[PDB]
Structure 1
Amino acid sequence: KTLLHKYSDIPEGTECHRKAYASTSIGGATGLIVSAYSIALKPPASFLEGVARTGRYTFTSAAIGAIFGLTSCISAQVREKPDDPLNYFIGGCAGGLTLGARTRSYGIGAAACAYMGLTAALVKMGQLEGWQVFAEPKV
């Protein structure tokens, strides 16, 4: 989880350039994973078409992370409140707008803001209270 540590180590509301670049890396990293699978299960055309598919998938995933990290961090600076879960929501769903921008669909962009923002808010709660998704066997 080197990339995950790269993001979470940066304190909220500061070093926005580092937080953005970390956001691009995490968004970029998941771009390769989804594109490599897409090439595998669905065989593309000649290699230039394959990388064209790979480029599109990586571009959106990196773009969703890029803007999300920017706005999630500057919001803490501007609003002077890093702890609020809304600080991730306002940028967490803007990634859905970015997805809609690269897919050219108002409906899918708006719906993605409905969902991604909620999940991005939920991630902030997870770090705050101490939520664990893959909890170790305790009992």
Structure 2
Amino acid sequence: AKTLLHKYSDIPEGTECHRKAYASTSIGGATGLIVSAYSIALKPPASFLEGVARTGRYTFTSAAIGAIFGLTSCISAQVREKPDDPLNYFIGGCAGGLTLGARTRSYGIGAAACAYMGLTAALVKMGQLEGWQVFAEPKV
């Protein structure tokens, strides 16, 4: 888990966009595989081929979302020359949401996913810049 996280974060912002996109794609693929496994367990497919198809669809959707997010964020950082601006991550998240809508073939899903994902990615970038702790070590 943290291996992929450090394979993505150690790549500096606005540098090696291909490798950054690959790392984001790997993270998305792992998330999609987890979701596919849970869906198969809770909602069993009728056939093995159906399960393989469901896993492939979910994994491809998640990996495409991750790849598009990474490419968009890195390209924005490169072009705008602003590696430490959350707007890059916002654009990447909205692009990922648009790709999610395209995969699901729904404009409303695309727009809602663009908005929420962009907000969440901007929040993640702000937390990285400032030092926000999602899981804070017990300090008292």
How many correspondences in the alignment?
Answer: 139
Instruction: State the 1:91 CA deviation.
Output: 1.1
Instruction: State the 1:45 CA deviation.
Output: 1.2
User: 2:44 & 2:9 partners in 1: Cα distance?
Assistant: 36
Q: Deviations over 1:25-65 (max 9, x none)?
A: 00011011000000000110110001001011101100000
**TM-score computed with the length of structure 2 as normaliser:** 0.98
Instruction: State the 1:70 CA deviation.
Output: 0.3
Q: Deviations over 1:101-136 (max 9, x none)?
A: 010100010011110000000000010001000010
SS in structure 2 opposite 1:93? helix
Q: Deviations over 1:55-83 (max 9, x none)?
A: 11101100000111001001111001111
C-alpha RMSD of matched pairs (Å): 0.5
**Who is 1:32 aligned against?**
33
User: 2:137 & 2:55 partners in 1: Cα distance?
Assistant: 35
SS in structure 1 opposite 2:13? coil
SS in structure 1 opposite 2:137? coil
State, as a whole percentage, how many aligned pairs show the same letter: 100
**TM-score computed with the length of structure 1 as normaliser:** 0.99
User: 2:21 & 2:81 partners in 1: Cα distance?
Assistant: 18
User: 1:85 & 1:97 partners in 2: Cα distance?
Assistant: 18
User: 2:18 & 2:54 partners in 1: Cα distance?
Assistant: 29
Structure 1 outlier segments of 4+, above 4 Å: none
User: 1:91 & 1:135 partners in 2: Cα distance?
Assistant: 27
User: 1:33 & 1:84 partners in 2: Cα distance?
Assistant: 31
**Who is 1:93 aligned against?**
94
User: Are positions 1:133 and 2:134 aligned together?
Assistant: yes
Structure 2 gaps of 5+ residues are none
